[PDB]
């Protein structure tokens, strides 16, 4: 082994669908839905002065990490990284990362601005038509990851065993209820504009109702990195990225030696061991996927 190969890439191990919004009364919410439409002129979205609760439905598919390696020109490099994944599964079965991701489901981080100031936020997780007891997501703060909730543990266990290749796949469907005043504004994600003269803000429709991009929801789920070198200075988790960038704070949290590129080079090419927290970060980026070729 001498360098990253000329092509190297990983498919998303944690696939996420787009989200479709729905509208409900909160009492009898378990039996009723209306499609939430978008209003033109700058577009905006609100509940229809009658219902007091939006609903969000979206799906997750988990794939085994060992099989997600999409292309790799060096057979020796493929063999080495497969072996290192087996080694990591021997250290722990991805369970810590799975618990962090399931926390980022339970804490309703995926709501983004829609989380702000809602009266109640209930979240339901469905797996193979088993429906799990609803998370009172208000009880989870955004700064700490809960290790001991039995529902989180069971979901995280099934996700972790899926990452380890003890399952072929795991289809997870998520449902969320957010209770807000009768015509409180709702914030679906915006579309890009390609410098058309109609620069006015446009909102993402999905099947003609409002929706959120899959990017936003996945990036919310990826907010699990607390291992970056001076976390003690800032204490907030960042979205996992190759340089640990963030869109709110311009300073990248992982330039140079703690970057993904350097840590992979050290782990694979030099065959160095490294701390468990940085191993978690490396496998978290393998879960994310990317291109990791030679520069």
């Amino acid at each position: 082994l001498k360098s990253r190969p000329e092509n190297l890439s990983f498919a998303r191990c944690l696939n996420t669908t787009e989200a479709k919004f729905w509208q409900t009364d909160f009492l009898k919410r378990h039996t009723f839905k209306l499609p939430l439409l978008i209003t033109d002129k700058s577009q905006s979205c609100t509940l229809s002065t009658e219902c007091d609760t939006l609903r969000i439905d979206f799906g997750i598919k988990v794939l085994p990490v060992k099989e997600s390696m999409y292309s790799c020109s060096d057979y020796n490099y493929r063999t080495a990284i497969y072996q290192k994944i087996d080694e990591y599964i021997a250290e722990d079965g991805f369970l810590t990362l799975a618990k962090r991701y399931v926390n980022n489901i339970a804490n309703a981080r995926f709501l983004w601005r829609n989380r702000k100031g809602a009266e109640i936020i209930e979240t339901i997780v469905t797996i193979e038509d088993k429906e799990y007891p609803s998370f009172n997501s208000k009880s989870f703060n955004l700064d700490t990851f809960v290790e001991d909730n039995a529902t989180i543990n069971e979901i995280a266990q099934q996700i972790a065993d899926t990452f380890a290749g003890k399952r072929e796949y795991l289809n997870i469907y998520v449902t969320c209820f957010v209770k807000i005043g009768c015509a409180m504004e709702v914030y679906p994600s915006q579309e890009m504009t390609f410098d058309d003269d109609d620069k006015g803000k446009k909102l993402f429709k999905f099947e003609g109702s409002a929706g959120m991009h899959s990017q936003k929801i996945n990036n919310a789920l990826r907010t699990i990195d607390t291992w970056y070198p001076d976390y003690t200075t800032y204490e907030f988790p960042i979205p996992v990225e190759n340089y640990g960038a963030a869109r709110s704070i311009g300073i990248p949290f992982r330039p140079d030696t703690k970057s993904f590129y350097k840590l992979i080079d050290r782990m694979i090419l030099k065959n160095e061991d490294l701390p468990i927290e940085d191993k978690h970060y490396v496998m978290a980026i393998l879960i994310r996927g990317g291109m990791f070729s030679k520069k």
Partner: protein
């Protein structure tokens, strides 16, 4: 000058000025109306650059320590503690920057309103550019409780360390 520090938490996925305009600033305004406008506001991380930014930190200011302590900010901001952090200490300080509401706001539409009460192009143009000078500063969206009108309070820093505050904690 006594002071207490409010920090908007980074990494929440919400622009800090949204938390200011919707949660912190109306609560502070309510307290200042309730407690006779004794208090100021300052923005330690303020920077002007090309467009004014408040930064993620607010400090409430007071001439009296017990007056500021009586506001009990930790108890009123409780339900927003997922993204608003309150420092437990009150600090005396000789270093602070007061801010003022900018002495012109929207002369364009205000003059249109006044002609509806009572534009010539050179007037309209100059007022347009006076507006565009104002619009580069920092600003907070406010909806008036007493009238329901929604408007942007434009803010500017000043070196004047003492004087009477407004209902929004700005130097009058």
């Amino acid at each position: 000058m006594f002071s207490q520090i409010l920090i908007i938490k980074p990494g929440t996925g919400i622009s800090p000025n949204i938390i200011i305009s919707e949660d912190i600033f109306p609560v502070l305004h309510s307290l200042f109306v309730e407690h006779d406008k004794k208090f100021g506001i300052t923005f330690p991380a303020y920077s002007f650059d090309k467009k004014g930014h408040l930064g993620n930190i607010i400090e409430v200011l007071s001439e009296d320590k017990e007056a500021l302590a009586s506001l009990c900010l930790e108890e009123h901001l409780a339900e927003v503690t997922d993204y608003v952090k309150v420092k437990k200490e009150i600090t005396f300080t000789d270093d602070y920057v007061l801010f003022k509401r900018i002495r012109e706001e929207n002369q364009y539409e205000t003059t249109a309103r006044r002609m509806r009460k009572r534009l010539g192009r050179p007037l309209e143009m100059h007022i347009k550019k006076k507006n565009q000078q104002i619009f580069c500063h920092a600003y907070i969206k406010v909806k008036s409780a007493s009238t329901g009108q929604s408007y942007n309070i434009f803010l500017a820093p000043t070196d004047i360390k003492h004087g009477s505050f407004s209902a929004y904690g700005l130097l009058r």
